[PDB]
Structure 1
Amino acid sequence: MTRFDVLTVGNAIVDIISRCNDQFLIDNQITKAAMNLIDAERAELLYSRMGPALEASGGSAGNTAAGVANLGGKAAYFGNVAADQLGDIFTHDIRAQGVHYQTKPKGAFPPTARSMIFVTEDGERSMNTYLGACVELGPEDVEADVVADAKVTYFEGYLWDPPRAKEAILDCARIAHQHGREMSMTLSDSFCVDRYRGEFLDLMRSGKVDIVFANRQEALSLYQTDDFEEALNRIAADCKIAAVTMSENGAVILKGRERYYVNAIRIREVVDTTGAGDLFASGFLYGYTQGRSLEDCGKLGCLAAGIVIQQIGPRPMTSLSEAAKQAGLI
């Protein structure tokens, strides 16, 4: 036995969520469906134009850890907030879900990261992220005992944006692999992939990453191709296990020459896609750490992702474990 099923590492962020029309995105030069990095000045400008909003703890990896705990697995999280109200909210929400979270704030400034997320009528989400305190995450925040005692350590491609987070991840990869654990990453966002293409490919080919999560767009961006079949063949060659999502088209899990196709669950209405990929990872990694088949892992991922897209906010407000039990996935 160990202490954690899944440790995740990411940018600790509080989400500020509002609905908008398509024209708002155009007028403000926000790239639709993407993660748009912004500075403090731009954060003030955008907020000044944003409608009344709702706040909810976010962070891709944070959502994933919360999701694993929700399903009934044991999760931990590394991510850096500030000693401010947003940081206190973030700390509370993740710990209240039963996720181990012990990353200590270093002061009040820069303030806790936030992302202004604009949800259009089609349920698509466009994020505008000021990293704030996230730029302070470094090797000093690695709890070596946690990495050593976690079955999987999972991290965001998004961590390549802040300056020193990657040093923490390399330390994690070493510790995890010396203790016979597995490393996982998500490609995060197609533009993120574009910024760090060579570095991501090296993480996979050097074996620092064992399990890779991607959506169609990210897989296409990784190999700079319009040919999805090429992207699948290439990704299977570069990592031990790849889990590739295709929105309403479900997912495909790849391992060597094996391919496992899973359907998306039936949806009432696409309310807000925020957190879909994160929760697919929750479902998958929970399944994986419970010794379930790759196909069943995919099924648990699709169930979790389908639930989260039918609510506002990135972390399911309902029991995923109960949903799994009812769906016959247990």
Structure 2
Amino acid sequence: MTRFDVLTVGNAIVDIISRCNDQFLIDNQITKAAMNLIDAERAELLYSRMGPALEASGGSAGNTAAGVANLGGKAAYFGNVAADQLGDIFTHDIRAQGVHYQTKPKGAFPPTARSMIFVTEDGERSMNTYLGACVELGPEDVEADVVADAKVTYFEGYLWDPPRAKEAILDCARIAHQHGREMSMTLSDSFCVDRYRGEFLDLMRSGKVDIVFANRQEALSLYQTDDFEEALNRIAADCKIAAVTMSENGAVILKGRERYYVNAIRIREVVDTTGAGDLFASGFLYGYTQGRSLEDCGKLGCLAAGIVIQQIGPRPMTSLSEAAKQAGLI
């Protein structure tokens, strides 16, 4: 038996969420639909201009772990918070979902990471992230026994921003592969790919990463192309399995020369797209670690992702296992 189906590793963040008008993004020089890194001074400034907000536990990988647990899989998470009230919220929410989470805070300062997420009327989300205690995640936070005992270890491209997180990921890759497990990553954000293009390709080509998740813009950015077909051909050459999401157009799963296209589910409306890709990865990785076909992994991903975009907050509040059962994915 294995203790875990999916271990995820990422920046532990609490989301601060508010709807805004289109002009707010322009006035504040926020890049729409992207992850904008900010310092402490900028965080205070944007917060002072932000309307009344809702808080919810976030973090890309955190959301993915939570989603796997929600669907019925056994998940674990590595990510560093501070010993503060935001850190206590993060710790509560992930553990309450039944994700193994044991990363120890190193003190109260830097404080727990937070992201101010502005949701426009079209449902797009523009994130503004102060990394705080995330800068302290390092090799010391690798629970080797967990990596040793997880079918898949999945991490964020976003980990390349903080200084030492990459060292932890290399340790995970080694331990995972020594125990015959598989490694996975998400490209995270198109600008993040702009920052770490060469390093990400190296992870894939050296075999440190087996399964890669990308959205359309991330895939395009990885190869600096406007040709989506080229991006699909190249990503298939660079990793063993690629899952490329296409928003309302669903997803395509690639393995060697195999291609499996999956449709998006029907939705009421796009309330808030925050978490879409994260939950696609939840459903995909849940199906994968249950031995399901790649097409069925894509279907489970589309189901979970389509549910999360119909609610405020990045982690489904409803039962994904019940939704999977009703959709006959079971």
Residue number in structure 2 paired with 1:213: 213
Query: How far apart, CA to CA, are the structure 1 residues paired with 2:157 and 2:2?
Result: 26
Partner of 1:231: 231
Measured in 2, the distance between the counterparts of 1:176 and 1:136 equals 22
Structure 1 distance, partners of 2:173, 2:22, is: 41
Question: By how many angstroms is 1:66 displaced?
Answer: 0.1
| 1:290-318 alpha-carbon deviations (Å, 9 max, x no partner) | 00000000000000000000000000000
CA distance in 2, matches of 1:256, 1:22: 42
Instruction: Quote how far apart the aligned CAs of 1:157 are.
Output: 0.1
| Distance in 1 between residues matched to 2:247 and 2:291, nearest whole Å | 25
RMSD: 0.2
SS of the residue corresponding to residue 5 of structure 1 reads: strand
C-alpha deviations, 1:76-105, integer Å up to 9, x for none?
A: 000000000000000000000000000000
The TM-score normalised by the length of structure 1 is 1.00
Please state how far the C-alpha of 1:153 moved relative to its aligned partner.
0.1
**Matches of 1:160 and 1:230 in 2, distance apart?**
25
Secondary structure of residue in 1 paired with 2:253: strand
Q: Which runs of 5+ in 2 are unaligned?
A: none
The superposition leaves residues 210-269 of structure 1 with CA deviations (integer Å, 9 ceiling, x where unpaired) of 000000000000000000000000000000000000000000000000000000000101
Moved beyond 2 Å, runs of 4+: none
> How far, CA to CA, are the matches of 1:216 and 1:265 in structure 2?
18
Q: Deviations over 1:198-219 (max 9, x none)?
A: 0000000000000000000000
Alignment partners' CA distance in 2, 1:321 and 1:288: 15
What CA distance in whole angstroms lies between the structure 1 residues aligned with 2:285 and 2:19? Answer: 31
Q: Give the paired residue count.
A: 330
| Structure 1 gaps, min length 5 | none
Could you give the per-residue CA deviations for residues 131-151 of structure 1, whole angstroms, max 9, x where no partner exists? 000000000000000000000
Separation in structure 2 between the aligned mates of residue 22 and residue 279 of structure 1, nearest angstrom? 26
How many Å apart are 1:110 and its aligned residue?
A: 0.1
What's the offset of the Cα at 1:8?
0.1
Cα deviation digits, residues 146-186 of structure 1 (max 9, x gap): 00000000000000000000000000000000000000000
Deviations 1:267-290 (A, max 9, x none): 101000000000000000000000
Distance in 2 separating the partners of 1:21 and 1:3: 46
Report the TM-score, using the length of structure 2 for normalisation: 1.00
Provide the C-alpha distance between the structure 2 equivalents of 1:23 and 1:168, rounded to a whole number of angstroms: 40
Determine the C-alpha separation between the residues in 2 that align with 1:165 and 1:195.
Answer: 15
- For 1:180 and 1:8, locate their aligned partners in 2 and report how far apart those are by CA, in whole Å: 17
2:14 match: secondary structure: strand
Distance 1:185 1:90 in 2: 22
Q: What pairs up with 1:11-50 in 2 under 5 angstroms?
A: 11-50=11-50
- Measured in 2, the distance between the counterparts of 1:61 and 1:21 equals 28
CA offset at residue 320 of structure 1? 0.1
Alignment correspondent of 1:71 = 71
Q: Per-residue deviation at 1:4?
A: 0.2
User: Which whole-Å deviations, capped at 9, do the CAs of 1:98-125 have from their partners, x for residues lacking one?
Assistant: 0000000000000000000000000000
Q: What SS class does the counterpart of residue 185 from structure 2 fall into?
A: strand
Percent of aligned pairs sharing the same letter: 100
Q: Secondary structure at the match of 2:274?
A: coil
* Structure 1: distance between partners of 2:113 and 2:284: 27
